[PDB]
Design a binder for this molecule. Structure first.
Ligand code: ATP
Ligand code: ADP
Ligand code: MG
Ligand code: MG
Ligand code: ZN
Ligand code: ZN
Ligand code: ZN
Lengths: 178, 623, 520, 48
């Protein structure tokens, strides 16, 4: 963030005071977009533009070409990624069962086939995305973790990429080690 | 009076503060400042105040040798009771500045006095009860440091009966000041300080500890507390030995004397001057940089200047230089990132001068950080939230990888890391960023740094009969993120033994008591080159590069070795960029491409088994 | 103005810390103990000065007598003040003050009981005279000071109240608990002359080296190489500094490997009983704070202080570590830090510090499996870690060989020792003589010669060529050979290393490497 | 920079950059108080 305020003091050496800031304004740089801070309103110009783009007879080809134009080949992989990002349709049944609508994809291959850059691009291009490996990240777990609050000494979700990315996509590298 | 001060009326403190003798010594100090001149006849103090005024400074340094020689009596009374003469000579310096410059008070209301060259040097263990409230000069190491705090200087008070704001009253840095009489009300009721109408200064506390080398055997180092005021704050960071001149005095305030036990007191030192017991450049240096760059054979000129204290290992040193200069990062449309930091790996047998190479790199880089997979180190590899022992607040700390953003991270004993360190290293190398989800904090930190690592083979000895992947405990995902693998084998040979042994024995005999670019210029050269050079490529080398890549691929597949993949082409381009940067040129030549090709091909061939290695030596003999 | 102090000493008798009684309160006696801790020297209020409040009268030179005291009445009838005073910290005097903690002697602790401790107070010019880890004899007065901690103990505790008989009419009760302390006036440590003639006579011997070797551990049969290591560990190399700031080590480290049925511990016991500044410790009866150092921040009068550990003690000496194979990882890292850089970094309770650890380490290690499998190498038979294992410049592996003459000679020696006791020792030199010789010889700093450099180079080439066993050869062995050669040159009291001493060092180093047996 | 704040800036306006590491719970402060005297029941008010 960027903060604008007043540098002041208060009384808590011989004539020492403790500084602090009186906030006048806050400016955020946009961090950690999640499902709790989404925008579900669209400007009319954006809506009309998107409807116009939809009617394009070659939309599928353009979308396929848009996914990482800096890699050579792998048209089928890119089409798979389009289908993944779009996602299926979920159904809730009268008896309670849930039919999921998301798509899972695995990539077997030899070293140096550009299958990590595809994951990185998917991470950079999806509205919600976490990129991690098996065994998680440095000081960040891979699944939900429950911890006690340091001061109140009570339970809360400490973290976990799997829940942090709810409503998005999770990119797992080295899936065979966990 | 006139130099009659040698007559003593009573104790020195009482004598010094009489108005008549105060005026006498003030006038004589003013004459000292205005008249003193060396043999050359130049106005040393005149120039000192002139530059003070030009730079808009706040303090004048003074030499104790000159003052002693001129005015021994004043020098002695200064050494005895400096508290009063600091004020007196502060006023003298104020009037001197007023004489030289008009309305200096407009900007600065005070000019401080710094003494220098005090004849006697003490250690923290020698101070006793005969040094109290006197002038001392000690030396030690800095062990802790507080933040900067504001201290009252010109207090203004609010009357609670009438809203008058009583005028400024000076704070002497001895005890808190109070008021009791309101002029408007003629009252004595409650008062409160005015926060918004008060002027403050800077306060900082530093703990000094003796240097361990100087402590005689069998004992332990002592320590003290130091006070730094105004522009002495944030001058000496922890971990440096310094010399401090100040006034040795008790905590006369203490806490209270009703405390049970023996009536003992604690003591501090109020610093008057501090001094220490670079990578910037200028036009003068820039012209020399450019002159040295224009010469032919500058790459080999640089390589010979790496780690002078080690014999041989030319491949190691060229790789170190390449990773120490670095390439250029790229990003196409902001959606395809290519890194620019070159990573190297040292895999050698015991006793091969690897840790020395890492120490040299640490001492020569602008931002180098040292970690290890085993042993004591000032920092780990993982990010965490920890309490601050002195401030007692939660803090967010990254590892050595986060700390060395846009630098180099050195890791010793790379083969002895645990699961957490391995995960952190893998994430930093794959993504150049480190995540964290701890104690209510979710964020990502940048980890764009260069890595130089050292390790040992399984069993402590290299098995040349097996591929490199089976000689180390590391795994392919981590091992494939390096682009310069260096393998050191302690093969037994006679001439090499003569050379190394003579080097070592000569080194030892020199250090018994009783071509290469200079290093200090090399540091600035590296900094400037990284700051100012971004070489590019010409599309006319595409044919050569593609043909070489095809040849490498075909031979590798034919010989059934580890696959050659596009990563090697990217490494070649990065190394060519670094080689071009070494020359300060804006373009990549064909010679740089040839050098990068040699480096990468040699690295790839040297890491195979004996049969495959010898087969590949014949094929790629062109380089 | 001058403060004068008297110093009694040479009392007829000495008392133990375990035999102090409240009958001798306020009398002069002498005690002995081992110093555990010392504090910094601080000013002590001696003769205070006060300013009266009701009147501006001034009172000077008010005595304190072990506590903060105030004047009891205004000195003038012009003012009737009492109990209202202010302290002037600008015209009073102070004295140096230090606190020291001592501990019982090892041989004085009775059966089945833990040692005692006693506080000792130092003043004036006696301060900064004791040193932690030393044995000192004190002399002074036995005094009493308040002890607030004695509440909660059983029994009746004296209380004081003001007598209210004889006071016209028309609450200050105090507790009297105390503890015994000691305020000392003379302190001396307890461990030239005509003997320069003896020193010159003995150095002028020709076979001095053989006697020097034989007089080490005279009660142990054989094992000459271990003796020649223990010697040359007492006498060390020279510490060198490079122009670029690289420091070269001068200490020699040794490890003795054997099974529990061998006599490796006797060497350590002899060294600790003989060497000037030596400490003995066990692998499992130690701790990380037991080694290295600790910080004791509850200094009752002011700021913190540091308490030395095992490695801190015996600085510039020798440290003995039995059961070395039971050290944990953290303590192993601490020992490695001491070996690499002669410093110990202590970071606890928000306090940082650095401490010298220039020490030589004498270690005794058991084989991993209990018996030394001669089919394996040295690395396969040990439990240490590579960093510490690469810093041990000598590995003495002692094994058992059955032979009639050896067995009968050993049995005769043991039976002689039991039957004859002190009589059947007859060593060439006595412990005092060895200590004097070593003290003299540790101050020579030998130097290399032009002829010696090439000979040493050729010896290193020979050793490398022959290596191509227990463990391979690197340059570390060359540095060890230089260190050993210069140590031997010091041992022979010469200012220049000669090729003969280089050959001696090379042979000693070579003989210590054993061969791995293979089948068929 | 956060390390460049010092005495000269006291009571002025500054612009700073950094990372948030801790937010607390919401507190309550008064902006308008109605008070009464427990002896004579005299009433008044205060505005903040
Ligand atoms: N080629 C060499 N030239 C000069 N000195 C050398 C050389 N090889 C080793 N040394 C010296 O020998 C000792 C070897 O220790 P060093 O820590 O440098 O080795 P290393 O290869 O890192 O081994 P390890 O960490 O596995 O013990 C050091 O004194 C080093 O200066
Ligand atoms: N088919 C390809 N087209 C373009 N670039 C490629 C291709 N294959 C590999 N690369 C290059 O290799 C790098 C990706 O390697 P990497 O992500 O490590 O592959 P993997 O994850 O399969 O090991 C990219 O920087 C890219 O420039
Ligand atoms: Mg990959
Ligand atoms: Mg090393
Ligand atoms: Zn008023
Ligand atoms: Zn009075
Ligand atoms: Zn009322």
């Amino acid at each position: 963030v960027t903060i604008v305020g007043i540098y002041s003091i208060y009384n808590s050496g011989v004539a020492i005071r403790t500084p602090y800031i009186k906030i006048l304004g806050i400016q955020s740089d946009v961090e950690t977009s999640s499902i709790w801070n989404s925008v579900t309103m669209f400007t009319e110009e954006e809506e009309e533009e998107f409807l116009q783009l939809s009617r394009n007879p070659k939309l599928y080809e353009i979308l396929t070409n848009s996914i990482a134009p800096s890699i050579f080949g792998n048209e089928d992989i890119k089409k798979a990624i389009v289908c993944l990002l779009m996602g299926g349709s979920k159904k809730i049944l009268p008896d309670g069962m849930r039919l999921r609508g998301d798509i899972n994809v695995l990539l077997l291959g030899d070293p140096g086939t550009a299958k990590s850059q595809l994951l990185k691009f998917v991470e950079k291009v999806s509205p919600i995305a976490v990129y991690t490996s098996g065994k998680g990240s440095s000081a960040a777990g891979l699944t939900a973790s429950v911890q006690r609050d340091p001061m109140t000494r009570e339970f809360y979700l400490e973290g976990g990429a799997m829940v942090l990315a709810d409503g998005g996509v999770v990119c797992i590298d080295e899936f065979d080690k966990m | 009076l006139e130099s009659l001060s040698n007559v003593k009326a009573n104790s020195y403190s009482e004598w010094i503060t009489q108005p008549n003798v105060s005026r006498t010594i003030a006038r004589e100090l003013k004459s000292f400042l205005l008249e003193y001149t060396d043999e050359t006849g130049r106005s040393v103090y005149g120039a000192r105040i002139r530059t003070l005024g030009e730079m808009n400074s706040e303090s004048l340094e003074v030499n104790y040798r000159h003052l002693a020689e001129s005015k021994a009596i004043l020098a002695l009374f200064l050494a005895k009771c400096p508290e009063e003469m600091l004020k007196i000579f502060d006023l003298v310096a104020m009037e001197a500045t007023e004489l030289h410059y008009p309305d200096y008070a407009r900007i600065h209301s005070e000019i401080h006095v710094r003494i220098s060259d005090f004849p006697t040097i003490y250690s923290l263990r020698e101070l006793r009860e005969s040094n109290l409230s006197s002038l001392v000069r000690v030396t030690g190491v800095v062990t802790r440091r507080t933040g900067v705090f504001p201290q009252l200087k010109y207090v203004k008070f609010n009357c609670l009966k009438c809203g008058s704001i009583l005028g400024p009253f000076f704070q002497d840095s001895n005890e808190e000041i109070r008021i009791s009489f309101c002029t408007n009300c003629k009252s004595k009721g409650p008062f409160r300080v005015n926060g918004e109408k008060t002027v403050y200064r800077n306060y900082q506390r530093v703990t000094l500890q003796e240097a361990p080398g100087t402590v005689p055997p069998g004992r332990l180092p002592r320590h003290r507390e130091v006070i730094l005021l105004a522009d002495l704050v944030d001058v000496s960071k922890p971990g440096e030995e310094v010399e401090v001149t100040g006034i040795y005095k008790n905590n006369y305030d203490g806490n209270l004397n009703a405390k049970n036990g023996f009536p003992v007191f604690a003591t501090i030192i109020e610093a008057n001057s501090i001094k220490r017991r670079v990578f910037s450049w200028t036009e003068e240096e820039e012209r020399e940089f450019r002159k040295i760059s224009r010469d032919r054979g500058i790459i080999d000129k640089i390589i010979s200047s790496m780690a002078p204290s080690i014999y041989g290992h030319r491949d190691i040193k060229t790789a170190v230089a390449c990773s120490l200069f670095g390439g250029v990062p790229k990003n196409v449309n902001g959606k395809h990132s290519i890194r620019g930091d070159i990573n190297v790996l040292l895999l050698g047998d015991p006793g091969t001068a690897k840790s020395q190479i890492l120490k040299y790199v640490e001492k020569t880089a602008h931002r180098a950080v040292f970690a290890t997979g085993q042993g004591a180190s000032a920092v780990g590899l993982t990010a965490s939230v920890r309490k601050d022992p002195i401030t007692k607040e939660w803090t967010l700390e990254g590892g050595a990888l986060v700390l060395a953003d846009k630098g180099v991270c050195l890791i010793d004993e790379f083969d002895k890391m645990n699961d957490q360190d391995r995960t952190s290293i893998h994430e930093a190398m794959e993504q150049q960023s480190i995540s964290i989800s701890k104690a209510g904090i979710v964020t990502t930190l940048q980890a764009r740094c260069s890595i130089i690592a050292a390790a040992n083979p399984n069993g402590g000895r290299y098995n040349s009969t097996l591929p490199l992947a089976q000689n180390v405990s590391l795994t392919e995902p981590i091992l494939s993120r390096f682009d310069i693998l260096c393998v050191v084998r302690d093969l037994v040979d006679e001439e090499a033994d003569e050379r190394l042994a003579t080097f070592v024995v000569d080194s030892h005999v020199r250090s018994h008591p009783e071509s290469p670019i200079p290093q200090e210029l090399l540091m600035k050269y590296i900094h400037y080159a990284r700051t100012k050079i971004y070489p590019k490529l010409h599309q006319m080398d595409m044919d050569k590069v593609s043909r070489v890549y095809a040849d490498l691929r075909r031979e590798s597949i034919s010989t059934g070795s580890f696959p050659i993949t596009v990563r090697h082409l990217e490494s070649i381009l990065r190394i060519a960029e670094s080689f071009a940067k070494m020359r300060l040129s804006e373009f990549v030549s064909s010679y740089d491409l040839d050098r990068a090709i040699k480096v990468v091909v040699d690295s790839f061939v040297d890491a195979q088994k004996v049969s495959v290695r010898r087969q590949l030596r014949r094929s790629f003999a062109i380089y | 103005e001058r403060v004068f102090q008297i110093s009694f000493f040479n009392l007829p008798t000495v008392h133990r810390i375990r035999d102090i009684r409240s009958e001798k309160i306020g009398s002069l006696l002498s005690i002995s103990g081992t110093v555990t801790r010392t504090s910094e020297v601080r000013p002590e209020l001696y003769k205070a000065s006060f300013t009266c409040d009701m009147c501006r009268a001034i009172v000077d030179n008010v005595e304190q007598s072990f506590k903060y005291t105030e004047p009891t009445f205004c000195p003038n009838p012009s003012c009737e003040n009492r109990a209202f005073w202010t302290l002037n910290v600008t015209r009073s005097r102070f004295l140096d003050w230090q606190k020291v903690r001592i501990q019982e002697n090892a041989n004085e602790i009775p059966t089945g009981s833990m040692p005692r401790t006693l506080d000792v107070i130092l003043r004036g010019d006696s301060v900064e005279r004791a040193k932690p880890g030393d044995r000192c004899k004190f002399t002074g007065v036995e005094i009493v000071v308040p002890d607030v901690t004695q509440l909660g103990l059983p029994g009746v505790k004296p209380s004081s109240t003001l007598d209210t008989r004889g006071i016209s009419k028309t609450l200050g009760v105090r507790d009297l608990t105390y503890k015994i302390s000691f305020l000392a006036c003379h302190v001396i440590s307890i461990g030239s002359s005509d003997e320069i003639n003896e020193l010159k006579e003995m150095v002028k011997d020709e076979h001095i080296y053989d006697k020097l070797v034989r007089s080490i551990a005279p009660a142990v049969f054989g094992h000459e190489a271990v003796k020649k290591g223990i010697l040359l560990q007492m006498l060390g190399g020279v510490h060198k500094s490079t122009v670029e700031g690289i420091k070269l080590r001068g200490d020699i480290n040794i490890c003795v490997v054997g099974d529990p049925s061998t006599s490796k511990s006797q060497f350590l016991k002899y060294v600790v009983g003989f060497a000037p500044r030596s400490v003995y410790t066990s692998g499992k009866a130690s701790s990380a704070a037991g080694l290295t150092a600790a910080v004791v921040r509850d200094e009752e009068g002011g700021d913190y202080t540091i308490e030395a550990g095992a490695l801190m003690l015996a600085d510039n000496g020798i440290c003995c570590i039995d059961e070395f194979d039971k050290m944990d990882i953290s303590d192993q890292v601490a020992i490695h830090e001491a070996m690499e850089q002669q410093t110990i970094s202590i970071a606890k309770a928000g306090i940082h510090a650095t401490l010298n650890a220039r020490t030589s380490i004498l270690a005794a290690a058991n084989p991993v499996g209990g018996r030394y499998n001669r089919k394996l190498s040295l690395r396969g038979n040990l439990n240490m870690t590579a960093p510490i294992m690469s810093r041990f410049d000598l590995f003495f592996v002692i094994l058992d060989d059955c032979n009639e003459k050896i067995d009968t000679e050993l049995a005769s020696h043991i039976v002689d020792l039991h039957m004859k006791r002190d009589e059947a020792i007859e060593p060439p030199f006595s412990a005092e003589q060895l200590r004097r010789y070593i003290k003299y010889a540790r101050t020579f700093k030998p130097i290399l010669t032009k002829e010696a450099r090439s000979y040493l180079v050729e010896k290193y080439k020979e050793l490398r060529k022959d290596d191509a066993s227990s463990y391979r050869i690197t340059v570390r062995q060359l540095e060890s050979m230089i260190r050993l050669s210069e140590a031997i040159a010091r041992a022979n009291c010469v200012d220049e290393i000669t090729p003969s001493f280089i050959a001696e060092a090379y042979d000693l180093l070579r003989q210590s490497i054993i061969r791995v047996d293979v089948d068929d | 920079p956060l390390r460049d704040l010092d005495s000269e800036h006291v009571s002025k306006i500054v612009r700073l950059s950094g990372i948030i590491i801790s937010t607390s719970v919401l507190s309550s402060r008064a902006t308008y108080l109605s008070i009464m005297c427990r002896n004579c029941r005299h009433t008044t008010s205060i505005t903040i």
